[PDB]
């Protein structure tokens, strides 16, 4: 009667950790700009995203356990660490300094400290006084005139970015090694967890782009029908929330001043460029969001609060309480130059029962320690001419305050600072299987002798 | 087609009359002047050493055995009907990889065994004995 | 860390009906955890009245159509909560009944054998007397 | 429905004793999906073992299953005063699942 027989190849899968790779794609490296400044040595983009969907798979899911959240953040810092070793080093640069307030306009009025100081230059037995232009965030002063040096002289190194390399996330498919395989949930509503029955298999991910961004989304994928309502642990108040964007949202920040740079010689082979003339006028960063579209988001969004948090409630909305510059803002690049906007106007409404652009103030910073991995500060040289970047907001990162009521009001607030929201909004439905070939089935056959 | 997985909301008979498509999948993957210090390829090349190694461990199995390739093959090795007592049309029309996969984890452990074992005994040894004429 | 907290002790006559309620904290979600519900009569062995797993209610044949299981996720004001409703008491009905939690995350976990499962997570309990 | 019946219904022992406790099914249960539980009176019970061999986490390794075709054992070596009370086992081969009748671990004196 029986036996056994040998099955390969049978579909046996489990779920395992490993490093994926990028696929970028070949049209970037045609803008190499001595690399480009993510990809450097990617794989090209396979055009074919083969995407098998699986019928009668229906697989528990969580966004909040498993992913290269960790790892891949490991990577982009990595990518930051090895950006920031061959380029320019500005470790001379911790020198007492003579500024005075500006004069054009009123804009800034102060903030601009027309900075001279003592350097030397590439005759290592010269010297060279020079003054330049400096932003208020870039410096601090020290206790005649008042004095400023630099917050990181007394903490850590700084280095500025070599100027041939960009600062654009680049759509960048991730690919699994094979053996393995990356699966999908392909339903319309999924807060992050539960099963899914809409499974497919791809061999990659879609083009995804690294956006460095706080308390929002710039640049991301948008949700469907209903902006979604994606977190850990509502009942915690310490877990952000994450709404990605049904519609998204049109802003307009701009660098409205025309500036000119001047490079002055630190060397040999070294050398800084500093601030030149604004030409023109002085103003402010700035953001502009039509009221309109900005009060449907707000109207859809507390929709989605009484379909998930409550049903009958009061929802006021204040801004953030304080703390740190990049926590306060919605702190982002426009370009090669950040953004810190006073995102405080955003967040005043109340919401109980029942032709515009809304321009709010944004400030730049140029000597950053981001991720606050501490030791190396980066510092982002000028760039002339009046910078207009367009982006589109592609969803919310927020905080629940504490209740501490019955339920009378609920005042939400922004949040962030980890990036790994941004992760996971932007890496969630995807996950890890290692996969299983063996079968053995016990039947009546048999082989010869 | 099925493509790549699509025997998977299937039986194992449908599913075994299949699955070459899926057995082939190893390898399907396959700028060096600009400044000339990479990290990607370490770890790229290293995850295909371990793949490849992988592989390797998956054809340690594949080559000693009595089931060198041989895509799917039957076997001598016997079954006690104390390891498990359904039916064929109760596993071959609906019954095809869960709990299926927990009792062979038990007889990947038995029935491993019982490779090296039937591979061992005399179906070398007996085929050297009946070979020397 | 996870228990689980019942209802408090109810009284109740002959064809009366009953709810009980169970918070459970420490549980994540109803997504990732199943709860079965079990009475034990008095110095008596243990049955199984019914469960729900994956937002599926059901129940055993005995108590088939008898008694409704309905349980609700988490919110922002309070852990997420499951619910055994039982008609038509008798005072073959009097037992104490538990709240059962056991996580489902994982397939090959042992614990649960599709839907059938042992029980990782129990409650201080509910006395239902009934008694005309 | 399986029917779970366990025995001994009482036994006694003493501290550092090994004892044993056994429950057949009136079906074989290949899978091995039998639990094992300890409930001292008025408390609610404790999962200790599944599956057979699988030890809940933070119960003591004093505590081993074993199962071979129908019969079953729970193994309590070096018995403590913790120990002492009501065991029953469970098995969820099968739907419902379905407990023994119980076996009580008196003192000796």
């Known amino acids: 009667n029986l036996w056994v027989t040998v099955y390969y190849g049978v579909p046996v899968w489990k779920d395992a950790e490993t490093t994926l790779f990028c696929a970028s794609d070949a049209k970037a490296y045609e803008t190499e700009k001595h690399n480009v400044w993510a990809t450097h040595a990617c794989v090209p983009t396979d055009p074919n995203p083969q995407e098998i969907h699986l019928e009668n798979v229906t697989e528990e899911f969580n966004m909040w356990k498993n992913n290269m959240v960790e790892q891949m953040h490991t990577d982009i810092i990595s990518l930051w660490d090895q950006s920031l070793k061959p380029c320019v080093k500005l470790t001379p640069l911790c020198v007492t300094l003579q500024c005075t307030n500006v004069t054009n306009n009123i804009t800034d009025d102060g903030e601009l400290k027309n900075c001279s100081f003592n350097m030397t230059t590439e005759l290592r037995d010269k010297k060279q006084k020079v003054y330049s232009l400096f932003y208020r965030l870039d410096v601090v002063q020290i206790n005649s005139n008042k004095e400023y040096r630099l917050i990181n002289c007394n903490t850590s190194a700084i280095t500025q970015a070599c100027p041939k390399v960009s600062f654009e996330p680049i759509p960048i498919h991730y690919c699994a090694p094979a053996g393995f395989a990356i699966l999908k949930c392909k339903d319309k509503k999924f807060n992050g967890t539960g099963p899914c029955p809409s499974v497919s298999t791809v061999q990659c991910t879609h083009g995804i782009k690294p956006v460095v961004s706080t308390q929002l989304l710039l640049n991301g994928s948008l949700a469907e029908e209903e902006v979604m309502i994606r977190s850990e642990n509502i009942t915690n108040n310490a877990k952000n929330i994450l709404v990605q964007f049904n519609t998204p949202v049109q802003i307009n920040c701009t660098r409205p001043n025309n500036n000119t740079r001047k490079s002055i010689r630190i060397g040999p082979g070294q050398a800084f460029y500093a601030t030149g003339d604004i030409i023109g006028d002085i103003r402010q960063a700035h953001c502009n969001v039509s009221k309109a579209t900005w009060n449907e988001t707000l109207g859809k969004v507390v929709k989605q609060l009484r379909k998930h948090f409550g049903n009958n409630t009061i929802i006021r909305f204040a801004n953030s309480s304080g703390g740190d510059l990049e926590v306060t803002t919605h702190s982002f690049n426009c370009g090669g130059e950040f953004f810190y906007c006073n995102t405080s106007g955003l967040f005043n409404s109340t919401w109980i029962s029942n032709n515009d652009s809304i321009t709010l103030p944004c400030r730049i910073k140029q000597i950053i320690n981001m991720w606050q991995r501490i030791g190396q500060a980066m510092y982002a040289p000028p760039i002339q001419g009046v910078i207009r970047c367009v982006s589109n907001i592609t969803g919310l990162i927020l905080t629940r305050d504490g209740g501490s009521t019955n339920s009378t009001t609920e005042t939400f607030r922004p949040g962030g600072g980890d990036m790994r929201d941004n992760w996971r909004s932007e890496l969630y439905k995807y996950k890890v299987v290692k996969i299983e070939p063996l079968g053995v089935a016990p039947t009546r056959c048999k082989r010869r002798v | 087609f099925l493509g790549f997985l699509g025997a998977a909301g299937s039986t194992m008979g449908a599913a075994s009359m299949t699955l070459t498509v899926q057995a082939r999948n190893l390898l399907s993957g396959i700028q060096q002047h600009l400044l000339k210090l990479t990290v990607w390829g370490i770890k790229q090349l290293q995850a295909r050493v371990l793949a490849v190694e992988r592989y390797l461990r998956d054809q340690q199995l594949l080559g000693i055995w009595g089931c060198s390739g041989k895509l799917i093959c039957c076997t001598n090795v016997p079954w006690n009907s104390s390891w498990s007592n359904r039916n064929l049309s109760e596993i071959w029309d609906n019954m095809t990889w869960l709990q299926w996969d927990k009792e062979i984890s038990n007889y990947t452990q038995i029935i491993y065994g019982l490779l090296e074992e039937s591979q061992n005994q005399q179906e070398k040894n007996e085929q050297d004995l009946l070979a020397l004429d | 860390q996870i228990h689980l907290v019942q209802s408090g002790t109810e009284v109740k006559k002959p064809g009366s009906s009953v709810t009980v309620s169970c918070k459970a904290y420490?549980?994540?979600?109803?997504?990732?955890?199943?709860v079965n519900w079990v009475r034990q009569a008095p110095g008596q062995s243990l049955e199984y009245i019914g469960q729900?797993?994956?937002?599926?209610?059901?129940?055993?044949?005995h108590f088939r159509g008898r008694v409704l299981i309905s349980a609700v996720d988490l919110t922002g004001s309070s852990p997420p909560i499951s619910s055994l409703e039982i008609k038509n008491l008798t005072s073959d009905d009097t037992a104490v009944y538990f709240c059962?939690?056991?996580?489902?995350?994982?397939?090959?976990?042992?614990?649960?054998?599709?839907?059938?499962?042992?029980?990782?997570?129990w409650g201080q309990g509910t006395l239902i007397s009934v008694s005309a | 429905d399986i029917q779970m019946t366990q025995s001994p219904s009482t036994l006694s022992a003493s501290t550092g004793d090994t004892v044993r406790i056994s429950c057949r099914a009136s079906?074989?249960?290949?899978?091995?999906?039998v639990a094992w539980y300890q409930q001292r009176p008025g408390k609610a019970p404790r999962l200790l073992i599944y599956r057979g061999a699988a030890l809940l986490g933070g119960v003591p390794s004093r505590f081993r299953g074993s199962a071979a075709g129908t019969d079953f054992t729970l193994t309590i070596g070096n018995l403590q005063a913790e120990d002492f009370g009501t065991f029953y086992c469970?098995?969820?081969?099968?739907?419902?699942?379905?407990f023994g009748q119980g076996t009580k671990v008196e003192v000796k004196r």
């Open positions: 420490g549980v994540n979600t109803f997504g990732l955890y199943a």
């Open positions: 469970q098995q969820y081969d099968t739907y419902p699942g379905t």
């Open positions: 059962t939690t056991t996580s489902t995350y994982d397939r090959w976990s042992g614990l649960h054998h599709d839907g059938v499962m042992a029980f990782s997570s």
């Open positions: 079906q074989s249960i290949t899978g091995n999906w």
């Open positions: 729900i797993w994956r937002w599926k209610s059901s129940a055993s044949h």
